[PDB]
């Protein structure tokens, strides 16, 4: 599940971590193997994944035009 999460925080969503076009990354529902108290910290953890996905989607899309927008995304990957 660890390596499962470390991909979800990379930009690849799966069955455990569903993806929604409006809200963002979030856990699907309760899982028997894991505890029912963790279902919160992950949701607190995904508030970060949603940022990286919405980042890289915009970075690729390049969207508006102009060099100063191209370079901004070019630098946005460095930080």
């Amino acid at each position: 599940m660890i390596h499962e999460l470390l991909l979800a925080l990379s930009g690849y969503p799966g069955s455990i971590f569903t993806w929604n076009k409006r809200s963002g990354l979030q856990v699907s529902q309760d899982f028997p193997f894991l505890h029912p108290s963790e279902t919160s910290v992950l949701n607190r953890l995904c508030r970060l994944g949603t940022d990286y996905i919405r980042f890289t989607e915009f970075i690729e899309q390049y969207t508006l035009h102009g060099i100063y927008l191209r370079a901004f995304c070019t630098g946005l990957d460095s930080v």
Binding site: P36, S37, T39, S40, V41, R44
Partner: protein
Amino acid sequence: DDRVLVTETQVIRETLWLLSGVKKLFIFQLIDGKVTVRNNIIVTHLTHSCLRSVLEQIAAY
């Protein structure tokens, strides 16, 4: 009156989460921005009331 009869080590793990600042915990269920201990928690020892006492202090934290 029924009670959940939680184990002992489980409490410390829950207490650590309260210290962390996470919400939605099986213990210390807040209602109005004020964390508050549940009512059915009991250990084999500690007569069901001292537990409500010791947790009440950590809740204040």
